[PDB]
Amino acid sequence: MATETNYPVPYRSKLTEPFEPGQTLIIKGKTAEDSVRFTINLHNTSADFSGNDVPLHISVRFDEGKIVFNTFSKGEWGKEERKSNPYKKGDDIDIRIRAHDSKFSISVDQKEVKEYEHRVPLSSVTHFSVDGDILITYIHWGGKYYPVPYESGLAGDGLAPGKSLLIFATPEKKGKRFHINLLKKNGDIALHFNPRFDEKAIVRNSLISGEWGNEEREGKNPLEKGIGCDLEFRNEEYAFQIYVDGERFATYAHRLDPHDINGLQIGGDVEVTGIQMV
Length: 278
Ligand SMILES: OC[C@H]1O[C@@H](O)[C@H](O)[C@@H](O)[C@@H]1O
Hints:
This protein is mainly beta.
């Protein structure tokens, strides 16, 4: 129990809106040398009753060495479904649950490991909770089905120094490349982020007045086909700080005046599950 001051356990959160197909629930935290198990439940209740139906129960067991799924409804549990637990007592955990119309898709360390068919109505999930030997460090519920190629404007102030655009996506299993453009009203691309698996590199460049700039490579490429990633475009005074999965992958000196970056485009071989401005 280190610097908790965030989401203490047991954690109970009453959903403000229904959990719907296309939306993802992200839970990250830390465990200890003596953690034995922790749970994540998607459940029903009127507001705080706590104890009705549990559409989806997830038990990560360090003693058993697996992650176990099941549901509780009408006063009884069904048959558990198991998957290997890739975590050893002590490491950080990252479990994401995305709702779909026929099931829940669960990924561990951004790796899809389980498809749990709905046994009870998804619409009956009104609450969510986490408990056990885990120190929760991050919880987020949002997203939707983002079609790609994708295009949209950004809030009002857009992406300006001091702001960050976070994108959660998964390069397609058999994809070759995809890109993300941060644009200004006149169509110029301040930042072109273009991972190329065939080239084993991520190209960064700018499009000014219909002309592509220098083209910056350098950098191993921390992305993997079929594995989810967290992309952060941190706009600062002198450059874009590009973070991939928590670590800085590269810096990109501004070639265009920051501010007024109110456009976004995403294309290529990639699935997008979350977009947010912070
Ligand atoms: O115009 C040249 C540019 O074309 C783009 O389609 C490519 O992704 C860039 O790597 C290239 O520098």
